């Protein structure tokens, strides 16, 4: 069912800077010790990226935030989830996000990958669910309330079963999962990358190239998308259905792409080391 979450602490949005990030391999060509100039949809260096987060402060009324709004999709999107737990699950795509047009559904709960393409019934807030206990003190999935319908699905990519941790460890973020979602006239190209981190509430500086991950030939019109997160509901926060929606620590960054030319330097083993924006400053030109 489509439950409407409430008792959320509203706050103005926050923006951060992308310190030379969002660079992916444009094509599947090996280049060694060369500087190639490619014109494609890249993330502009030092951009005003949007910063969403999800935390719950104890004490007073607090800052109980759970950010997952509908964001446009012009030519691409950058996604760098920085968190210590496994709150982030996946994303949804489509044009109207209802049962009137096709849509993409990528879920990564701790049972299998749930990449599907159908006409779902995505609610106004596709929650997830984890649950803690005292007799069997182990985190387990509790809810999968994302869609409430079924139609003529045109794709299905359930992967091998895996058992994640799904716990609620406390501390500094030590997992940086970067994603780049593209769509060039016939496909949905996903570029992923995972690098360690030891930050708290900021985006790290450095050059990390994102490796290609999939080339789904699902021809659809995507203009809007929405992120999916998990809300821990233990015994410490009881109440009604949409009352105990604690989220722990979680923060993902968004960012759009635009047609730009980059100068990529390839190492002798064939990996990208640094890049030039070519339209950021006269020295770059």
């Amino acid at each position: 069912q489509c439950v409407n979450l409430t008792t959320r602490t509203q706050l103005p949005p926050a923006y951060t800077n992308s310190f030379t990030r969002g660079v992916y391999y444009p094509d599947k060509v090996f280049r060694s010790s060369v500087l190639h100039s490619t014109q494609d949809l890249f993330l502009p260096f030092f951009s005003n990226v949007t910063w969403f987060h999800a935390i719950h402060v104890s004490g007073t009324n607090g800052t109980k935030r759970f950010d997952n709004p509908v964001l446009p999709f012009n030519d691409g999107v950058y996604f760098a989830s920085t968190e210590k737990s496994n709150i982030i699950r996946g994303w949804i795509f489509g044009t109207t996000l209802d049962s009137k047009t096709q849509s993409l559904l990528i879920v990564n709960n701790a049972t299998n990958v749930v990449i599907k393409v159908c006409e779902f019934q995505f609610c106004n807030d596709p929650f997830l669910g984890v649950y803690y206990h005292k007799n069997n003190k182990s985190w387990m999935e509790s809810e999968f309330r994302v869609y409430s319908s079924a139609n003529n699905c045109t794709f299905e990519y359930v992967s091998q079963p895996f058992l994640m941790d799904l716990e609620g460890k406390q501390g500094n973020f030590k997992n940086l999962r970067e994603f780049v979602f593209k769509n060039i006239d016939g496909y949905f190209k996903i570029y992923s990358k995972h690098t360690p981190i030891n930050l708290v509430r900021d985006l790290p500086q450095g050059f990390s190239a994102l490796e290609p991950l999939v080339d789904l030939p699902i021809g659809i019109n995507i203009t809007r998308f929405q992120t999916l997160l998990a809300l821990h509901r233990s015994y410490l926060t009881p109440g009604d259905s949409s009352s105990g929606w604690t989220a722990g620590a979680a923060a993902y960054y968004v960012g759009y792409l635009q047609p730009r030319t980059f100068l990529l330097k390839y190492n002798e083993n064939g990996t990208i080391t640094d890049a030039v924006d070519c339209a950021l400053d006269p020295l770059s030109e």
Partner: protein, 364 residues
């Protein structure tokens, strides 16, 4: 040499006459391993089929469909294709394939065709206009036929009008063939379109059922996922041959390189956007595409007014791809290498000169 500079008498010197070019030997083609075979072995091979008005579709996408193992089976009755030839089917890539499952009776197999009318072709099914597809039929009396009366199948005897193209009317209500609606038991101004089909094991060929599967293709704007199987030859190394791995067509010598590509990187180019190394799809090995041996063919003549002997120079050849002198400028065939040293009469290259000395020959 005479034909080059439009004359029958050439002077002393070295003249460029033609270009040496090693021709390719084979046509090596290496496509990835055939995997994700389309389930065309369960639509045909099915325990229980469905009625003619219950043509359940089994749409398939993102698969490798071999339309040849179906044609070359010698177990069908009428492999009638439309829009595309019955052969050369595994060379076209489609978006999605629509299958059909129904059991028509005898002559009704001739009704599923573009531009044909009949009982089934107007009541249960209705094939549209020109459309790329095919018909697959085979004997149904073998296992489907019940010994003692086969009445499990159903058939719409009469419908209100002609069916729409690729439509399924599940409207099972008692039609009024007579007068004001009966709205009750059949028999008086009451006609149920679905009564029965009827069969018998002691029947011939024209009065027996048949399992027909109408494969329907589509060329939608979506990328063609359903593709034909691509064959693959062997791999001969250390030989200038033509290669086509996944579209990168060209000629060259496929050697073994010590490079280390990335798991996702397949091809490899040079500073001037020229392919120099590729990854074989089947076996994850990195090759080295070196250009086929080529060069210029020069002719050294001391003049037709002195002699008719000539020496050929294959520039940029290792004398293993053509007296044979291996110089730093090419292979000089037709001249002897002397240990003496004289002034340069005809320049060859890299400090080598050729002349005509005495019993007469050309010395390098």
């Amino acid at each position: 040499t005479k034909c080059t500079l439009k004359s029958f008498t050439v002077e002393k010197g070295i003249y460029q006459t033609s270009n040496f070019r090693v021709q390719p030997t084979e046509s090596i083609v290496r496509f990835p391993n055939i995997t994700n075979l389309c389930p065309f072995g369960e639509v045909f091979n099915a325990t229980r089929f469905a009625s003619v008005y219950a043509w359940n579709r089994k749409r398939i996408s993102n698969c490798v469909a071999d339309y040849s193992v179906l044609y070359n089976s010698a177990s069908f009755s009428t492999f009638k294709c439309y829009g595309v030839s019955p052969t050369k089917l595994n060379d076209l890539c489609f978006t999605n394939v629509y299958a059909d499952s129904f059991v028509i009776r005898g002559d009704e197999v001739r009704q599923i065709a573009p531009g044909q009318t009949g009982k089934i072709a107007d009541y249960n099914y209705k094939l549209p206009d020109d459309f790329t597809g095919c018909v697959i039929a085979w004997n149904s009396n073998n296992l489907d036929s019940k010994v003692g009366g086969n009445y499990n199948y159903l058939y719409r005897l009469f419908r209100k009008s002609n069916l729409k193209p690729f439509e399924r009317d599940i409207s099972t209500e008692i039609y009024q063939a007579g007068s004001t609606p009966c709205n009750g038991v059949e028999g008086f101004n009451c006609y149920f379109p679905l009564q029965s089909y009827g069969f018998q094991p002691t029947n011939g060929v024209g009065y027996q059922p048949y399992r027909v599967v109408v494969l329907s293709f589509e060329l939608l704007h979506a990328p063609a996922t359903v593709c034909g199987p691509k064959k693959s030859t062997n791999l001969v190394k250390n030989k200038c041959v033509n290669f086509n791995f996944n579209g990168l067509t060209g000629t060259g010598v496929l050697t073994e390189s010590n490079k280390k590509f990335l798991p996702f990187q397949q091809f490899g180019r040079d500073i001037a956007d020229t392919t120099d190394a590729v990854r074989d799809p089947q076996t994850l090995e990195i090759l080295d595409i070196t250009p086929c041996s080529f060069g210029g063919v020069s002719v050294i003549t001391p003049g037709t007014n002195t002699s008719n002997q000539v020496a050929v120079l294959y520039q940029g050849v290792n004398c293993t791809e053509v007296n044979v002198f291996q110089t730093r400028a090419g292979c000089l065939i037709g001249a002897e290498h002397v240990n003496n040293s004289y002034e340069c009469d005809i320049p060859i290259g890299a400090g080598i000169c050729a002349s005509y000395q005495t019993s007469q020959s050309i010395i390098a």
